[PDB]
Structure formats: C-alpha cells, structure tokens
Design a protein around this nucleic acid. Structure first.
Lengths: 228, 276, 228, 228, 69
DNA sequence: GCACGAATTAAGCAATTCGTAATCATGGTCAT
DNA sequence: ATGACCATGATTACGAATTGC
C-alpha cells in the first residue's frame, strides 16, 4: 500500500508499545502491549491491503524511511513483504501470525466516569521530570477542589509517602474523590493535546487519552482508590 | 498422594454443612470404595507372579482438603518431593483445626532470618487456607513491616578470603565478590578510625546499599555479630531503607510457590477485562 | 528565588567543580573541591533569600532548565527546596550540611606575582587539543621575555622534557623566573576572555582566575619553581 | 601543508579505509586497506611538498579542525610533524614509513570490461539499508538486459541465492552474462555520483568507483562467475 | 576445500555423523529437559528420547552408537 | 567388617560448556 | 545543526564443573 510520513511517525510511536504489530486490512490500526498494560488505536487516511505480522517494527520502519514516500508495499511470492521504490525493491520477511501479540478485537471504550483536558507541554514536562526526578508513579487526584497530578518514587517510598512532584491539571466539578495510580513505563504518549476519560469499577478501571492522531488506553494500578 | 477433586466436584461442594462433613466424606470414601479396590488390585499382583501370600496394607494416611467455602488452594506441589498441604486428618485422627504439612520448601533454610521464615510460613498458611486477597494484602503488609526490623538480623553473612586478590585502592576487582567489595568500601570508610581491621578468614556480615550512596559503592561489610561505628550507623540505615534485597530472600521463593499455586501475589492489573 | 540562564550555566560549571554547594542569602556564592585544590566564586544576577545546602546539583540544574523561568524557588513546608510555577510544583530534599563540603570564607588573594591575559579562543583551543592529545599538565613559564604555556603529561614525561603544546601567552617584562605546574583535573570554565594572577612564595601559593562575572582559584603544585 | 575541507573529508574517507596514510608530494593521495582488499586514490587540489607517514588520522583530523584551515604543516626539526597556526604550535609524532601499510605505485586500472553509472542517492540508500537488512555481500549482475545489484546475506546462505534487496541501474547492451560478487565490508566510499568500472580476465578481477572527488578500487571474489 | 564442500552435503549423513558414547544419560538432565549444564551429546540424546515417546523404537542404552547432529 | 592380613601401578590434567562480568562497538533522543 | 550521553547487543575472559586421555 501507500504509506505517508505521518503514518510512519505514528507507526514508530506505536513500535514502542510493542515490537511487532498486525496490519489488518482496513483503516483502523491498533495494537496492545505484550503484557496488556496498554492499548493503542489510530485511524489513518492510507488503507492497508492485507494482514502482515511484521516483527521488527523498528527495523522495518528504519529501512522504509530510507526510500521514497510513494514506494509501493505488496505481498511477495514467498509470503514476505516487498517494498518497491521507483528504481529498487527490498524484501522484508513477514513472521508467523501467531508470534505477534495483537488485540483480537478493537476496544469499545465506554462512557467514562470523569473527563478532563491536558495541554501538550504538560506531558513533555512530566516525562522530563520523571527522567530527572526518577519519578516512578503518577497519581491523578483531586486536591483543594482542583484535579491535580502527583509524582511518587515507589522504588524508595513504597507507601507513596513523599509527593516528589505536583501539577494542577485543572478544574474539578463533582464529589467523587479518586487517586488513579499509573506507571511511568506504560506512559508512551506522543506530544500534543490530550483528552483524559477516566472510569473506575471495583478494584480496576481504565483511563483513555484521546488525541487528534492516535488514542491510548491504560489500566490502573492496585493502589488506585475510587470513591463515588 | 492421589488427587480426588473430581469425585468431590461430582458429588457437589454445596451439599455439605461443615468442613467436618467434607473430611468425613473423604475419610469413608477411602474405606468403603478405595480400600477394597486396593486390596483386590494388590491381590492381582500376588496372583500375577503367584507369590506366597498377600501382606501389603494401604490406608488413608493423610487427607488434605481446603477449608470449606474459602477460596484457599488447599495444597500444591512444586517439584519432586516439595509439597504443601492443609492436612485435616492424619491416621484416623480428626483435627479440630487445620494442620499444616510442608516439606522441601525454602521455609527452614538457615541463611534467612527468623522473621523471613515466619512470614513465609504465614504466606503458606494463607495460600493454602485463605483466599487470593489474603495473600495479596499480606505481601504488602509484610513489605511495609519488613524494613522495620534490625539491620544485622536481616543482613546475611559470608566468608571472605584472599582480599588482596580482589582489591585496587578499594574499588572492585576482576569478578570481585560481594563481601570483598563491601569490606573494601568499609575499610575506605573508616580508615584510621581505630576499629579492628577486617582480614581474611573471618566470617563477615554483608548487606548492599542503594544507588547513589555517599560511600560510592553498593555494598557494606563488617565482622558478624559486631556493631559498626555509630558515625556511619545513621546513613547506612537511611541508605538501605526499603531496599530490594528481600527480592533475593523472600519475594523469589514466594513467587516460586505462588506460580505453582495458580495465583500471583502482586495484582498485575491490565486491560484484559476490556478485551473480552 | 529566581534564576536566569547565565546563573544556571555557571551553576552547572560549579556542579562540574563539586557535587554539593552552599547557598548563602544574597548574591555571593562559593564552592571548593573536596580535596580543596580549586575554589570558585560567582555573583549571581538575582538575589538569594535563604541559606540552603545542595547535594545533587545536576538534577537541580536539569529541573530549573526544563521549567519556566517564572517559577519560584523557595523553602518548602518541611524546610526543603520547593520549585513552583503557576502550574506545577517540585519538592527536592535538602541534605545535611555536615555531609557536604563548603568553603569557610573567600580567599582575598591580595598579591599577584605574575599577571597575564588569556583569550577565550586560545583557552578553548588548549582545552580541545589537551583532550585530543591526553594532556594532564600545563607548565606556565617565561622564556626569552615571553610568557608561554607548555603541555606535559607527567605519566609519560616525569622529567618534563617532551613538549606537546606551545601556548605563548604573550610578552613578559622582568627577570623573575617562574615555572608553574597545573593538573587538568581541576579547572573548568566557560569560554571567555580571562585574567590570570599567579603567586607563590616558598612552598605556598595559588593562581587566581578573573572572569567578567565569576572567579576561580587553583592551588599551584609544590614542584613549581619560583625565583622572584 | 594547506589542507582544504574537501581534502580533510577525503583523508577522513582514507582513514576509514586505513588508519595509516602517507602524504606523497604533489596534489595526489592514495592508500590501501590493511588486509589489502581495497585501494583508494584522489587528485586533491592542495599541494604537498614532502612525504610523511601518519599512524592515526581521526585525531589528526580533529586537531586540524581545532585550528584554522590556513595553518601550515611541515616536518618538525625533531623528526616529527609541526603545525603552525597564526598563534598555536602543535607537535605530532612521526611514524616510520615501513610501519605503515601503503601501496608502492598508483594502480593502473585496466580496460573497463563493464561500465555503469551509480547515482549518489541509490548508492547511499544501499549503504544505509545494508545494516537494516543484515546484508554482507552484494552481487552486481545482468537480469533481463539490465545491470542490477542484489544484496545477499552470506551467513544464512553460503550459496548466495536468497534475494533480500534488489536495485537496478540501467539497460545493459551486451550478451556477456555474469554474476559478480562484492564484500559489503569493503564499501567505504563518500556518498556521491560514482562510475562503476568492471574488469575481469579469467580468475583475476576488480571493480572501480570513480567519484567527482576521489576513486576507489574494490576487489572481486573467487565466487564471481564471469564470461565475456 | 571446495571439492569437499561440494561432496559434503550429498553424501550419507551417517558417515559425517559425530558418533559418540552416551555416558550420563540421566545425571545432568532434570526431567527429560537438560536441566543443569548439559554436554553437547546429552542434549541430543534426550532430544531423540523425548522425540520417540510412543514411536515404538528402543530408547537409548548407554554406550550405544548414538550420533549427535 | 573382625582380627588382621601381605603384598602393593591407574597422575596429572586437555578440553568443553556455561555464567557472569568487563569492555567495546552502535543506535535513539536530546541540548545544542 | 552536531556530537553527548545512556541503553543495548558483540566480543573476550575466566571461574566452575566435569570427563577425556
């Protein structure tokens, strides 16, 4: 098929969630982590001709980006993938469908308990401080009446005693009080605006970061505490 | 030991009223049904080779069963001759309370502190009798409590020999042992402070340190039983708080058991319930 | 408290000097090596309102660089460092002053046996050529009425014979015969036109380094020869 | 010496080919690989007045980069290399000519049995994709009247029969079918437009890549089957 | 070398098979799988033994002409 | 193994396999 | 814009165990 640069960037970001993905024929591209902690979805203008079980997404995209944009991608005679430039072609193997852990069904993320909005620079600053403050855990909470963010270091404070970092996400309207606990390792967002949709039930729940290009779904740690 | 869960499922768990009913059923099932089968299937051995006479006996030495209604596993294996069972009846002696029976586990090895072994045995009691939430909450409770004991009892001890082989101004050498690195860093810490020097052949107690400690190394070592100087006593206590060492002592055996028990201690939350 | 780009960059240089630092209320900031071979002083553009001890300076530099400059740095409720802008808030513990090493007082350095001027470009050329050529020793002397600097590696040239660099500082007027040995493991500076004031009587002396905003002091090696 | 930036890049290429080079007098330079599987030459625009053997070049390149392009390099009075800038003097050790691997006389390339024109972008794309597709040799040959290059991984196919990446050059007007082979480890040319000159008589054979800047000669292999 | 490579594949696999003596058929392996450090030959011994479970062939006897491929 | 006994020879490793560390090339992302 | 720095495979080395002569 025809692949554009924005689609390649989305694919490269998706490659950090899992090494391999399955490009089922259609318009909805989507993947999940090998441990199931996160799931990603996206819709792109380019369509996919057939399902391929690409294994080394990093290598595949690396070799792909070195050729012209309008290179054509189709099935080789042995079942592998053939990417032809205007004057050359490359034969990239396609692994067995089984060896790639892929979400069997797209997740219909239902109506969330709470909604909020986060700006592009907030995620950049959060990731940078987590790299600097060795932050291990992020907590979405409500303090003073405003929805805010707290940073913790589980490695030392296992009881999240010291709030190493704080951020005021925005205004809160409601009475439900919650502490959504999320890992940093599973936070693989790309820079930009995001819309947070949070839902909790029992001991579990989900948070969905909706974006203008791709959307992510992330689970909550056991330390998360909800009060509706 | 023969698993008889299929028969219990066939009859039904809910029809009982107390755990004593469960044990009584499992007891008389062997005598009424299993025991004559044992007798006939060993008389067939006596007939097969036409031996002299039949003398073998076989009666219900032990009945293992999980507590009635509880989620509890009720017994599990780990390898050849390493099991665990919430035995309720041993040699036709009803137990008013569960009688724990383990062998080959890592709950009695001398290299671990007594609190570690007591916690391991309590985790066994939970994973056998109590449910998952019990083993889950006990893991974090013991994680909180585990740092709240003395440093010397928790820390292990090793024998250090041939220090001069693995020293270069106190830094690690070629495959420098943990105790050697710790003792070199300790000698660098209190050089000329008057304490007794640590030499080869003396049994020395050792514990690691967190990343970024002021000593510059991730280890510390000093003669066993003895107490290190007070000046370096504070930071070494503060720089080992909530350390990972018990992953090398208690979490690893707990995983080794729980994995074979069809359960996990720390709840690995994910999106699996959205996928289905 | 407020900080600027130049202040943060020179604080970074200070971190290269020593890991910890002392912050006295005001403008005038000191640091010295653990062994005390070199000392550095700077007057910040801003004003300091509290005294604090810093253990991990590089992390502080990263935090202050990634955050907006309008963020306010002050004492937290627990007497630690609190950096809070209108959006976020970061808490960093303050270490015990006993563990850290700070200078007792600034060194006035009243007398200057030799005075010379070194340009920024020549200093950077010396730095880069020393890194390339593995030079850990500079000998500053005067030959034929010219102040010159020669590179030497005492590991290979304990006799100080093999000359690898010739850095002619300039012209000299006087019959004083001096040769000073300095080890590369100490001095660290930003590229700028600089002044050097050497002094050594008997076996004791130092070299003061005058910059447009900051100053340093380097303890001359005892093997340096002086005939004044 | 007066080495221009283009000359510096050319000797960087030579350094990648071989650590040690000799600067014969004139405006011409040449070198060969340590194992003697690759030769290179260049008709530089800078004059050379004497011969000198240098063991290492990357450090020499860095030192030349530190100083201006107009610095004069000559033979030092102590049997070494002396570099004089407007201010700086640099001493570089001199190596024995017999201690450096280098050819005797420039290679007279025989008549080109085959001629092809490899473009800059195609050759550079081949080099970049070499690492991606874990290729270790390439066969230049004739397919449906076109001269083509196909990359083969020798590790997983000792017979060089599994196509992984194929690139075309242009129509070949001849019936002299052949299947050459080139070791990828010897492809050490600067990215640009080059001229492919193939020669092969019986067992003997070679290839030559003439760019607008320099020229390289790569050695064929005994597994190449040629017939004209 | 070239001739030998040419004729190495086409010949019968037994005459190139590295035939060795099976000494410790059960000392290293834990249960079929080569549990602890396993000698090159013992791994193949257990591989074939676990391959022919129920295939109706006599399992390995120690000292046999077992060839490791 | 009781009760000794009466005569006495195999030595010391070459080589492989594995694990863990130590060092070294190489890429991804960032202040610049 | 360009390498800097951190993280991740190759490669080397040696302890440890075992059997082979």
């Amino acid at each position: 098929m025809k692949l554009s640069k924005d689609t390649t960037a989305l694919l490269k970001n998706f490659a950090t969630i899992n090494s391999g993905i399955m490009l089922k024929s259609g318009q909805f591209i989507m993947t999940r982590a090998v441990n199931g902690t996160t799931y990603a979805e996206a819709n792109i203008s380019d369509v996919i001709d057939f399902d391929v079980a690409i294994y080394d997404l990093n290598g595949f995209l690396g070799i792909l980006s070195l050729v012209n944009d309008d290179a054509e991608i189709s099935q080789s005679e042995d079942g592998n993938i053939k990417i032809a430039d205007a004057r050359s072609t490359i034969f990239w193997p396609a692994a067995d469908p089984s060896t790639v852990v892929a979400p069997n069904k797209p997740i219909p993320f239902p109506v969330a308990s709470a909604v909020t909005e986060i700006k592009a620079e907030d995620l950049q600053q959060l990731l940078r401080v987590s790299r600097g403050l060795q932050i291990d855990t992020i907590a979405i909470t409500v303090k003073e009446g405003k929805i805010v963010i707290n940073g913790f270091n589980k490695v030392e404070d296992s009881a999240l005693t010291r709030v190493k970092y704080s951020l005021t996400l925005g205004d809160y309207d409601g009475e439900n009080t919650f502490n959504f606990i999320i890992n940093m390792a599973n936070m693989k967002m790309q820079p930009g605006n995001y819309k947070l949709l949070l839902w909790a039930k029992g001991k579990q729940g989900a948070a969905k970061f909706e974006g203008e290009h791709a959307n992510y779904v992330v689970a909550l740690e056991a330390d998360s505490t909800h009060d509706f | 030991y023969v698993c008889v869960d299929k028969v219990i499922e066939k009859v039904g768990l809910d029809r009982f009223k107390e755990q004593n009913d469960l044990v009584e059923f499992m007891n008389q099932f062997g005598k009424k049904k299993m025991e004559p089968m044992i007798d006939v299937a060993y008389r067939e051995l006596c007939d097969y080779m036409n031996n002299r006479e039949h003398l073998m006996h076989m009666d219900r030495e032990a009945i293992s069963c999980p507590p009635l209604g509880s989620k509890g596993v009720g017994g599990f294996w780990k390898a050849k001759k390493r099991y665990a069972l919430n035995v309720y009846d041993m040699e036709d002696k009803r137990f008013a309370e569960p009688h724990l029976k383990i062998m080959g586990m890592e709950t009695q090895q001398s290299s671990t502190p007594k609190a570690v072994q007591e916690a391991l045995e309590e985790s066994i009691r939970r994973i056998l009798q109590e449910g998952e939430e019990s083993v889950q909450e006990y893991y974090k409770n013991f994680e909180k409590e585990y740092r709240q004991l003395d440093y010397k009892v928790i820390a292990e001890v090793k024998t250090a020999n041939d220090i001069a082989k693995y020293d270069d101004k106190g830094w690690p050498g070629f495959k420098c042992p943990f105790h050697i690195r710790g003792v070199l860093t300790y000698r660098r810490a209190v050089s000329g402070l008057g304490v007794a020097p640590i030499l080869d052949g003396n049994k020395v107690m050792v514990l690691p340190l967190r990343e970024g400690n002021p000593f510059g190394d991730k280890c510390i070592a000093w003669p066993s039983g003895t107490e290190l100087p007070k000046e370096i006593r504070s930071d070494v206590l503060s720089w080992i708080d909530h350390s990972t060492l018990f992953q090398k002592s208690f979490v690893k055996p707990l995983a080794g058991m729980c994995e074979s028990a069809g359960m996990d201690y720390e709840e690995k939350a994910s999106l699996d319930f959205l996928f289905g």
